[model samples]
Target: GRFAQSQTREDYLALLAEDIERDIPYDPEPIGRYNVAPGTKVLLLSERDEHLHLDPVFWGYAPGPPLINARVETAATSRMFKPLWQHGRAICFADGWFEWKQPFFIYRADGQPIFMAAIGSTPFERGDEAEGFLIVTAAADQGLVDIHDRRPLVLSPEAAREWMRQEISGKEASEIAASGCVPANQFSWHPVSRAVGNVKNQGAELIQPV
Candidate 1:
């Protein structure tokens, strides 16, 4: 049970939308909100068939309850995720993520966008039946661990730029995720309105520090 928001503009994504060849239409409203919930068709950047593209992938897997996240430490070895790691790597860019213990607004202190690593059940698919993905998580480095033991595995802009390469192997993908996680000190968190817990209540005010 968590939440994330994508404030990044299509123009900014244009920088990473390199040579994109296709797009699966989706409701833009979900990505625009401060509280983007799971199981929605949100934007996901992935490469398949030698073509890089952005598509609206569902937020979780199927045949069960939504699997919203996968831990970086065991993902490469986990049978559930290994296939996805090998071929379904994706990136979900967001401004921040919310944690409930403190109801924190955890974001880059620089206030720049965060590129969240993820794995899709399908390389890139369209519509409701396409079971979606799980955001990858890692040990919260030295500082943020105080708030939560796990944090989304985020990478720098350049690393994220290269992450979409369709040729990279699962091992290389894991390596990049391991070595390129943004330093914890570069992130900052704050208490915010409880409204975010309610998926229906959304607006800039939801992220405003309480």
Candidate 2:
């Protein structure tokens, strides 16, 4: 489900309603085709040193060095994400996210704002290595099969806390990603405006049905 019908920062964060520090300033880079998909500032929630905070990390997983979507089927054995999966430095928050088969305004029947649970690490102060994160996606459910083959790991609130606590292990990560959100089968979607097609466009009109 890839229909994210929101533009204001508050609506984006309201879905999960978790306590977060929004002290990080909103740094909106000018909208561009390459820089930002949906071309808006993304609000990300992360747990640093046990304190949960919301900030903007670039929207897409940086694409130069590694494949961002670490395949769930083999992630436990994959070299790129295995360590973080084992050690549990991965986490994120989301109202909703999107994907498309044809890249137009169409959406899956059910693609609403279920929380996005991601895995990540922060190795340096503000470098790419520390900023990189991956949304653990698995085989799509009946609700999503017509639109795409995969969906992000939608974590339960308790498991999210485990990620915050750094207690998630590779075995646990595998188990969670495999059975966690796929069959949950809960969401909704609609055709949004091609206004969302323009990177410079902003506001609710952007997601309004065409």
Candidate 3:
């Protein structure tokens, strides 16, 4: 539930703007502070009609605990995620995300926004409605295993293009994840305040070194 502040709220909007192929059909304005938690609407990208759309989706799946993250290893067979895995793949956009116990704000060392592999179903069949998504994760990289054994399934811009295409099969999803996601070592992190553990706490300082 913790993230770094947008240098400007439009940071994500600007990043998405670079690629004309991906049209942000929804409101482009940003909201929320540094710490975004489960159950809130967060920006995500999905493909429909061969067009990539930047839209806001709920951070977790419904009818269950906010299923914020799904393990790529089990997603294909997991009853809770198999259906969506077959039809509703997505990519979560974030400057970075946070972790707790010993809190840290993790981001790319290169200053690029992170694109996390994900899957979800939109709440509405037609019309603008928030979609619910779960960030997919794979086994951690050697550099990150000390911090956590799992990390978001980060994808490259090229790999993401293939991932977002509507026709990806369950087998393709597993293969793509195995070959395309970023290793955790590419990211850097710093210890942040314990305030991030509280869902109510929000602000830029939550991601600052304590």
Candidate 4:
């Protein structure tokens, strides 16, 4: 799965109000289908001064072929993501992420957002390069293997905060990732309009089951 969507700023504010105790700024862009893909700006959560902050980060790392997802099984060992796993752990905010071939809108049944495990690079600078991130994925749960071999590593709210901790070790991080995931079957999905296949499509209607 590659495409994902975030809630509007207002939606996120209401969802994360308790966790985001302080003000963190962001663009005033309207909330809608993000059609997020490689190189696009997406919402990410990172820690600064021991506090969580909401911000934007490019969706891929250019060191390779604009990679948007990194396999969790190898991320801690892969040279491209080792540094990030060790020092740049972050969380990507999305109400849902999608998969192709008769598009499915996968989301939490409880109406909560999914906090995807991710890692980021240093801040972006002017010119042809910019900071980016890679979403971590693992082998799909038993029931979902037929749809896709891999799925984003979702973190529970508790694990999410712990993952942001700068002091956590790799072993601990991996454990948190494994334990935090909501099983594939635990999530609910429904067929949606093929309109979502087009990057320009928008509106809440696109997510409604056909």
User: Residue-wise lDDT of candidate 1 within 68-109, one digit each (tens)?
Assistant: 888888889898889888877888878888887658888889
lDDT of 1 at 85: 88
Which ranges of candidate 4 are over 4 A from the true structure?
Answer: 4-6, 13-23, 26-30, 123-128
Clashes per candidate (backbone, < 3 Å): 0, 4, 0, 0
Candidate 1: residue 28 Cα off by (Å) = 11
Residues 1-210 of candidate 3: C-alpha lDDT, one tens digit per residue: 445435433565454445556555544555545777778777677788666676667777765255678889898888988877888888777778887638878888888877788888853123233447888888878777777777888887667767877788877977887898877768888888888888788876887778
Best by lDDT: 1
For model 4, name the residue pairs that clash.
none
Query: What is the Å distance of residue 170 in model 2 from its true position?
Result: 2.3
In model 4, the number of clashes is 0
Q: After superposition, how far is residue 152 of candidate 4 from its true place, in Å?
A: 0.7
User: Each prediction's TM-score against the native?
Assistant: 0.87, 0.67, 0.84, 0.87
Off by over 4 Å in 2: 1-41, 59-66, 102-112, 124-131, 182-184
Better of 1 and 3 by lDDT: 1
If both were scored by lDDT, which would come out higher, candidate 2 or candidate 3?
3
Residue 203: error of model 1 in Å?
Answer: 1.5
lDDT per residue (tens digit) for residues 27-72 in model 2: 3442212212522234456556655565555333443343355566
Residue range 161-194, candidate 4, lDDT tens digits: 7887878987788888888887886688887888
